[PDB]
Coordinates of C-alpha atoms and ligand atoms in Angstrom, one line a residue:
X1 CA 0.0 0.0 0.0
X2 CA 1.1 3.6 -0.6
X3 CA 0.2 6.0 2.2
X4 CA -0.7 9.8 2.2
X5 CA 1.2 11.6 5.0
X6 CA 1.2 15.0 6.7
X7 CA 1.9 17.6 4.0
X8 CA -1.3 16.7 2.2
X9 CA -3.3 18.2 5.1
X10 CA -4.7 21.7 4.1
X11 CA -3.1 21.3 0.7
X12 CA -5.1 18.4 -0.9
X13 CA -4.1 19.1 -4.5
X14 CA -5.8 15.9 -5.7
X15 CA -3.4 15.5 -8.7
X16 CA -2.8 12.0 -7.2
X17 CA -6.2 10.7 -8.1
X18 CA -5.7 11.1 -12.0
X19 CA -3.1 8.5 -12.2
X20 CA -4.6 5.8 -9.9
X21 CA -5.6 2.7 -12.0
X22 CA -7.8 1.3 -9.3
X23 CA -9.4 4.4 -7.8
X24 CA -8.4 3.7 -4.2
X25 CA -8.3 7.3 -2.9
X26 CA -11.0 8.4 -0.3
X27 CA -11.8 12.1 0.4
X28 CA -12.0 14.1 3.6
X29 CA -12.5 17.8 4.1
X30 CA -8.8 18.8 3.9
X31 CA -7.0 15.5 3.3
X32 CA -7.0 12.3 1.1
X33 CA -6.2 8.7 2.1
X34 CA -5.2 5.6 0.2
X35 CA -7.2 2.4 0.9
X36 CA -4.6 -0.2 1.7
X37 CA -6.5 -3.3 0.5
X38 CA -7.3 -1.7 -2.9
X39 CA -3.9 -0.1 -3.7
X40 CA -1.9 -2.3 -6.0
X41 CA 1.4 -0.5 -5.3
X42 CA 1.9 0.7 -8.8
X43 CA 3.6 3.8 -7.4
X44 CA 2.3 6.1 -10.1
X45 CA 0.7 8.6 -7.7
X46 CA 3.8 9.5 -5.7
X47 CA 5.7 11.6 -8.2
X48 CA 2.3 13.3 -9.1
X49 CA 1.7 14.7 -5.5
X50 CA 2.9 18.5 -5.4
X51 CA 3.2 18.2 -1.7
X52 CA 5.3 15.1 -1.9
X53 CA 3.2 13.6 0.7
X54 CA 2.7 10.1 -0.7
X55 CA 5.1 7.3 0.4
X56 CA 5.4 3.6 0.0
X57 CA 4.3 2.0 3.3
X58 CA 7.7 0.6 3.9
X59 CA 9.2 4.1 3.3
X60 CA 7.0 6.2 5.5
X61 CA 9.3 8.4 7.7
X62 CA 9.7 7.4 11.4
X63 CA 7.9 10.4 12.6
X64 CA 4.9 9.8 10.2
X65 CA 4.2 6.1 11.0
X66 CA 0.8 7.1 12.5
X67 CA -0.3 7.8 9.0
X68 CA -0.3 4.1 7.9
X69 CA -3.0 3.1 10.3
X70 CA -4.8 6.5 9.8
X71 CA -5.1 5.8 6.0
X72 CA -6.5 2.4 6.7
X73 CA -9.1 3.7 9.2
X74 CA -10.4 6.8 7.3
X75 CA -10.5 4.9 4.1
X76 CA -13.3 3.0 5.8
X77 CA -15.4 6.1 6.5
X78 CA -14.6 8.7 3.8
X79 CA -16.2 8.8 0.2
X80 CA -14.2 7.6 -2.8
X81 CA -12.8 10.4 -4.9
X82 CA -12.0 9.6 -8.6
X83 CA -11.9 13.1 -10.3
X84 CA -9.3 15.8 -9.7
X85 CA -10.6 19.0 -8.3
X86 CA -9.0 22.4 -7.4
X87 CA -6.4 22.5 -4.6
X88 CA -7.7 24.0 -1.3
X89 CA -7.5 27.9 -1.5
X90 CA -4.5 28.5 0.6
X91 CA -2.8 25.2 -0.3
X92 CA 0.7 26.6 -1.0
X93 CA 0.8 28.7 2.2
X94 CA 0.4 25.3 4.0
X95 CA 2.6 23.2 1.7
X96 CA 5.7 22.5 3.7
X97 CA 4.3 23.4 7.1
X98 CA 5.2 20.6 9.5
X99 CA 2.8 18.9 12.0
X100 CA -0.4 19.6 10.2
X101 CA -2.0 16.5 11.7
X102 CA -3.4 18.8 14.5
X103 CA -5.4 20.4 11.6
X104 CA -7.0 17.2 10.2
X105 CA -10.7 17.4 9.9
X106 CA -13.0 14.3 9.9
Ligands
LIG1 S1 0.4 3.3 -5.7 FE1 -0.9 3.1 -7.6 S2 -2.7 1.9 -7.0 FE2 -1.8 2.7 -5.0 S3 -2.8 4.7 -4.6 FE3 -0.9 5.2 -5.8 S4 -1.7 5.3 -8.0 FE4 -3.3 4.2 -6.7
LIG2 S1 -1.6 16.9 -1.4 FE1 -2.9 15.1 -1.0 S2 -4.8 15.1 -2.4 FE2 -3.1 14.0 -3.5 S3 -1.9 15.3 -4.7 FE3 -0.9 15.2 -2.7 S4 -1.7 13.3 -1.7

């Protein structure tokens, strides 16, 4: 499974969904997750993310390990997203800000 980590929060560019062959992204208010059972590990999404927030599960940074289980959980409750849309309004003000998990909205 690939995993969306911290820098996606309050950015949510959604360029990542265009390239997904199996449509395994699920949408929240200010974040996207990858559904771990559905992802086929084709890796096509991770050089598409402007925020460089997508990682292979086995390559998630130490200090972002919480995001593996978070992706799995929220992929259960959030609606599937298959079409790109506009980035959130202030997305590049927030691109690169660390510790954005305190800002995650359900
Ligand atoms: S690695 Fe491939 S299958 Fe998994 S989320 Fe990214 S684009 Fe979709
Ligand atoms: S910011 Fe998030 S919505 Fe996709 S393009 Fe990057 S993982």
